[PDB]
Amino acid sequence: IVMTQSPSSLAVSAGEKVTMNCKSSQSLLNSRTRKNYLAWYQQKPGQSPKLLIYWASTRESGVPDRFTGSGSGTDFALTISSVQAEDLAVYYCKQSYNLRTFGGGTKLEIKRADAAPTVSIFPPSSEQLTSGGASVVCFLNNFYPKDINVKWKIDGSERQNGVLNSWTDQDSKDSTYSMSSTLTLTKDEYERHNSYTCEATHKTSTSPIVKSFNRNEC
Amino acid sequence: EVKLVESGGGLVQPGGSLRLACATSGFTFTDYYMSWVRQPPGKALEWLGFIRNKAKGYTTEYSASVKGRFTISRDNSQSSLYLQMNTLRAEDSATYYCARDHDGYYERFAYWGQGTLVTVSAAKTTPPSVYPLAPSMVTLGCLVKGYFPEPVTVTWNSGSLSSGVHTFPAVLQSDLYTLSSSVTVPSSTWPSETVTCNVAHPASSTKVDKKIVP
Numbered sequence: 001i002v003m004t005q006s007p008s009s010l011a012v013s014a015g016e017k018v019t020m021n022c023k024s025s026q027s028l029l030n031s032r033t034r035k036n037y038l039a040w041y042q043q044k045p046g047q048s049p050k051l052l053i054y055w056a057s058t059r060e061s062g063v064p065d066r067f068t069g070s071g072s073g074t075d076f077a078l079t080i081s082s083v084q085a086e087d088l089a090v091y092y093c094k095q096s097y098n099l100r101t102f103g104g105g106t107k108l109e110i111k112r113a114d115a116a117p118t119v120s121i122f123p124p125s126s127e128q129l130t131s132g133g134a135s136v137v138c139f140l141n142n143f144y145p146k147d148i149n150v151k152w153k154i155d156g157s158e159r160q161n162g163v164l165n166s167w168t169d170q171d172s173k174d175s176t177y178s179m180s181s182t183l184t185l186t187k188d189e190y191e192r193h194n195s196y197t198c199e200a201t202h203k204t205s206t207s208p209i210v211k212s213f214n215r216n217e218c
Numbered sequence: 219e220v221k222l223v224e225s226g227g228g229l230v231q232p233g234g235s236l237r238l239a240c241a242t243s244g245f246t247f248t249d250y251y252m253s254w255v256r257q258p259p260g261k262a263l264e265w266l267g268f269i270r271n272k273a274k275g276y277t278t279e280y281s282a283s284v285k286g287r288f289t290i291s292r293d294n295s296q297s298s299l300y301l302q303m304n305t306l307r308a309e310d311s312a313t314y315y316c317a318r319d320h321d322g323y324y325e326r327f328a329y330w331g332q333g334t335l336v337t338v339s340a341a342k343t344t345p346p347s348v349y350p351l352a353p354s355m356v357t358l359g360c361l362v363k364g365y366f367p368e369p370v371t372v373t374w375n376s377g378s379l380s381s382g383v384h385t386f387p388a389v390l391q392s393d394l395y396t397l398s399s400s401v402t403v404p405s406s407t408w409p410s411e412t413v414t415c416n417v418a419h420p421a422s423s424t425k426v427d428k429k430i431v432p
């Protein structure tokens with residue numbers, strides 16, 4: 001049996017309601033027991049999954065009323081009301097009608113006000129500069145929404161080679177995202193150039209936020 | 219209080235074998251079906267199989283993706299469940315969970331362990347280099363470059379600094395992970411107070427402190 005969830009993610013504001021959908025490739029309704037063998041699980045980032053709902057609409061003990069499971073046959077849904085920061089997670093449906101199968105998950109995000117990133121640039125450490133390589137790091141911290149563009153410029157020219165980017169999960173404390181961008185060169189190539197710029201373009205402003213440094217000045 | 223604790227995970231060569239264990243407590247073990255479920259990092263849960271309860275004669279079932287290759291068994295005396303994995307490939311890389319499953323009535327996995335991380339690669343275990351990143355509000359960081367396999371744990375002041383921290387997911391390149399962590403603090407507390415990131419990389423017995431010097 002194949003389980004499919006939609007949408008794959010969505011964003012809801014605090015105190016509002018979310019509905020997410022789970023579809024089965026064949027009916028999960030057990031005619032003998034008169035129950036749909038479909039369960040809902042919550043998985044917060046880096047944590048173990050937790051049971052919310054079973055038999056389609058029965059909330060596990062200790063799960064609050066604000067979670068509601070519904071549906072029948074092949075068509076199910078989980079609704080969360082008064083969505084709070086604690087709800088940041090991926091939600092999985094799971095059939096147990098014939099063996100068990102999980103859906104691909106729906107990621108719940110908390111929608112908040114748009115927020116400009118705090119951008120910080122770091123030159124290679126002197127200790128790394130005693131090594132063979134050189135990493136230039138730029139942090140773009142506590143912004144909303146999640147998508148952002150970073151461009152590196154070395155001596156005034158864009159450099160895309162050896163740039164690696166990484167995003168945090170939405171922040172629990174303020175619902176923002178952060179990203180790191182790391183530009184790694186050989187030490188020799190690092191020392192053949194002077195001007196290093198990190199440029200963040202975010203939907204908050206038309207103008208990128210720019211941090212730079214000149215190797216000569218450190 | 220029910221508890222389930224997975225163990226046996228680690229770095230294993232492609233083509234290898236690995237036995238995982240799940241030690242359970244807090245419940246009448248033989249009353250319950252028990253499942254294994256896995257999750258590749260940043261991806262979905264996948265049910266692998268179950269072993270049935272006393273009533274059903276402890277028989278087993280498996281998902282198509284692992285039927286024939288993985289074997290589940292239980293030791294009732296120990297309240298323990300096992301997964302024997304054979305011919306491990308890269309896509310078997312995942313956190314492996316055990317879960318308490320059905321009892322003959324309750325259609326559910328109420329309890330799940332914390333997971334055990336399995337990495338299937340021929341890439342070599344390598345400790346990280348740890349580099350400080352030094353410059354109202356001020357942001358510092360640590361760059362944790364060139365390690366394998368996952369995970370590392372980064373803290374700030376052995377855990378005493380916990381707000382204003384962003385530890386970014388590692389990225390893999392040419393068989394080495396790199397990640398950075400940042401911490402934002404009041405200017406009126408650095409560099410007047412010391413700041414040290416601590417990086418642990420268990421897989422290589424690595425514990426590093428690196429002071430952020432201005």
Ligand SMILES: CO[C@@H]1C[C@](O)(C(=O)O)O[C@H]([C@H](O)CO)[C@@H]1O
Nearest residue numbers: 096097098099270274320325326
């Ligand atoms: C809730 O788990 C049940 C386990 C079992 O009883 C079985 O032992 O395979 O199968 C049930 C199916 O609906 C088939 O009856 C359910 O999947």
